[PDB]
């Protein structure tokens, strides 16, 4: 009290100093049971992969990813994560996984990031402007890369307009960049709109190949199938835990509900838009989530010309829960003596009920 | 503080960047008020048959702590087994030699 | 997986020749058949690799040029072919399967399973 | 171009190592294959990853990297060992899998 006014002395009354919260004393952690292996080695070990004007998607669903092979790798030369950080990529389970795959040149490793423009970016792979992934991305030039310029790679060097997010472009029309309607045919202001570009091993790094394998990880709410490979615990109910539920983080107490979800629900959510119950992911119970009880801590105190003995006020706590104690509607009142006299208000409690010292302190 | 880095790793030895250097190797504070002076060192520190007394941690078990300097010359294991305390399977030496 | 390439072959030089490498047991249609030579009791020499699906080609320098090497991606065989057969070229030819994943970025090329060869005399 | 002892030659049950030498385009990267050649049959994959073991494979065989040369180390010999070990790697410089020049290792 005396460190809340920044004095020595403090005067009679009630003040809020602190907050009394029960910690957590155990971490529930509860993810499908599903331990095949996540074929995320498959996207990264192909031996082929796409040209960027039409990039091979594959789309990752119902395994158990482990992302410490992606950040213990000391091969990658470029590992750029937009909305999430690679170490912490473990602790979370993601709804789906999408592995675009492309071979892109060097110089434009920059331009396969959010926001970037260049012709990569603009008509031939653009990444959204909320990008939530990680651009992995190695020097592929003595993979990709021969003698004579391999031509396999094509990238769409004219478009009409700019791609849109996640859009690929297969056509093969004839760009006519001349009044005169081209004809569809090669002449002037007619040519294939995907200019092939030619790397020998001996180039110079911004005509060096750099191979990219963006994992656009996708967090929205529903079932998720793809997760981090952390290990579950047993659950623990109608006590202060710190939960990860599927991806669903936080503190708080678990106990059993009465809420009727659909088979096709995953989680709930208050009033206040905030989650206040969840779907196990092993066994199908449907759980309410509380908050691990809180409250404010107020001093109750004479003044340092009379004592140095004080009472506490845990308010809205019950006397049960926080290990002369007094439990009142406004809450758990520790070190004040309740007595049956009633006298004038001196030091207020709450909920009717005033303290003073009068010797010790009485409620 | 002194030391000899990689040049595609330059980047990393700058506040709050990530890496094999900057998280295993040496991590500069997040709220660092300083110079990264540096140059191309490329005709001093480097001989034909490769520099090896220059050794960067390529596994930690721990990302490194700010300023802290990691002389642990223990070796790592990356698998279940305990794997020694000698090399074989899943026990190198920590500390890779760059050429 | 049990590649199972072709017999022996003697022929004279500038005379044109075909040893096939047929695959069996896998997609061979998605991984690469590459070849490499070996001289009598002397090292393994790489030549280049065929990828069935796409055709592609990739040589050694020391045989770009003259060795033409295609595919058949239908029969499931890969074809070794000469543009000119030469006196010093017999050797005891293999072909076996690589992969060039990146396993996380670590390039490999470990031509994991072989065939039993052709023996290749010239005379 | 990778370089290797003409020969190598020990007592059964000893431990034997073979060096594999190279520069630092070759095996500055990841590659130090391992292939053997017994007489009339054909290499398969023995050490990978410098020196991961594929399964399939006798446990006694391990090799590692020293620098930008290799080192094979065939504890507990036995007899049908006469195999021509190759370490391979792909020189980078115009690509292109270079075998080193072959051990020919005798039992005694």
């Known amino acids: 009290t005396k460190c809340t006014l920044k004095s020595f002395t403090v005067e009679k009354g009630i003040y809020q100093t602190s907050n009394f919260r029960v910690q957590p004393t155990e971490s529930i952690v509860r993810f499908p049971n599903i331990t095949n292996l996540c074929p995320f080695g498959e996207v990264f070990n192909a031996t082929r992969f796409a040209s960027v004007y039409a990039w091979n998607r594959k789309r990752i669903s119902n395994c158990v990813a482990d992302y410490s092979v992606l950040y213990n790798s000391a091969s990658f030369s470029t590992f750029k994560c937009y909305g999430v950080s690679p170490t912490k990529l473990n602790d979370l389970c993601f709804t789906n996984v999408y592995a675009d795959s492309f071979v892109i040149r060097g110089d434009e490793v920059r331009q396969i990031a959010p926001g970037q423009t260049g012709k990569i970016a603009d008509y031939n792979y653009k990444l959204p402007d909320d990008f939530t992934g990680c651009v992995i991305a190695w020097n592929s030039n003595n993979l990709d890369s021969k003698v004579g310029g391999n031509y396999n790679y094509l990238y769409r060097l004219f478009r009409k307009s700019n791609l849109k997010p996640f859009e690929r472009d297969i056509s093969t029309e004839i760009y006519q960049a001349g009044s005169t309607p081209c004809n569809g045919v090669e002449g002037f202001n007619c040519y294939f709109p995907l200019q092939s570009y030619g790397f020998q091993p001996t180039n110079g790094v911004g005509y060096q190949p750099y191979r990219v394998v963006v994992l656009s990880f996708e967090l929205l709410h529903a079932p998720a199938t793809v997760c981090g490979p952390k290990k579950s615990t047993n659950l623990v109910k109608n006590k202060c835990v710190n939960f990860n539920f599927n991806g669903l983080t936080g503190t708080g107490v678990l106990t059993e509900s009465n809420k009727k979800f659909l088979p096709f629900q995953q989680f709930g959510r208050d009033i206040a838009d905030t989650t206040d119950a969840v779907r196990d992911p092993q066994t199908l119970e449907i759980l309410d989530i509380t908050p691990c009880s809180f409250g404010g801590v107020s001093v109750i105190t004479p003044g340092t010309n009379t004592s140095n003995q004080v009472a506490v006020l845990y308010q809205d706590v019950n006397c049960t829960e926080v290990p002369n104690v007094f439990q009142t509607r406004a809450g758990c009142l520790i070190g004040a003596e309740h007595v049956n006299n009633s006298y004038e208000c001196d030091i207020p409690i709450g909920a009717g009920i005033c303290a003073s010292y009068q010797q010790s302190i009485i409620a | 503080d002194s030391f000899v880095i990689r040049g595609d790793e330059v980047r990393q030895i700058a506040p709050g960047q990530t890496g094999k250097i900057a998280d295993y190797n040496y991590k500069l504070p997040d709220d660092f008020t300083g110079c990264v002076i540096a140059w191309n060192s490329n005709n001093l520190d480097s001989k034909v048959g490769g520099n090896y007394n220059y050794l960067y941690r390529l596994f930690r078990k721990s990302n490194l702590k700010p300023f802290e300097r990691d002389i642990s010359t223990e070796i790592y294991q990356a698998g279940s087994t305990p794997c020694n305390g000698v090399e074989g399977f899943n026990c190198y030496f920590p500390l890779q030699s760059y050429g | 997986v049990q590649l199972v390439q072709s017999g022996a072959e003697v022929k004279k030089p500038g005379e044109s020749l075909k040893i096939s490498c047929k695959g069996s047991?896998?997609?061979?249609?998605?991984?690469?058949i590459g070849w490499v030579r070996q001289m009598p009791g002397k090292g393994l020499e790489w030549m280049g690799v065929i990828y069935p699906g796409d055709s592609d080609t990739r040589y050694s320098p020391s045989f770009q040029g003259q060795v033409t090497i295609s595919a058949d991606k239908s029969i499931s065989t890969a074809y070794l072919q000469w543009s000119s057969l030469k006196a010093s070229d017999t050797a005891m030819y293999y072909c076996?399967?690589?992969?060039?994943?990146?396993?996380?970025?670590?390039?490999?090329?470990?031509?994991?399973?072989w065939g039993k060869g052709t023996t290749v005399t010239v005379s | 171009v990778l370089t290797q002892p003409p020969s190598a030659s020990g007592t059964p049950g000893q431990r034997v190592t073979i060096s594999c030498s190279g520069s630092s385009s070759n095996i500055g990267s990841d590659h130090v294959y391992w292939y053997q050649q017994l007489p009339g049959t054909a290499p398969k994959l023995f050490i990978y990853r410098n020196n991961q073991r594929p399964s399939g494979v006798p446990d006694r065989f391990s090799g590692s990297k020293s620098g930008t040369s290799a080192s094979l180390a065939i504890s507990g010999l036995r007899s049908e060992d006469e195999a021509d070990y190759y370490c391979?790697?792909?020189?980078?410089?115009?690509?292109?899998?270079?075998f080193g020049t072959g051990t020919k290792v005798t039992v005694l």
């Open positions: 076996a399967r690589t992969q060039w994943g990146y396993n996380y970025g670590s390039h490999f090329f470990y031509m994991d399973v």
């Open positions: 047991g896998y997609s061979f249609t998605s991984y690469w």
């Open positions: 391979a790697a792909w020189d980078a410089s115009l690509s292109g899998y270079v």
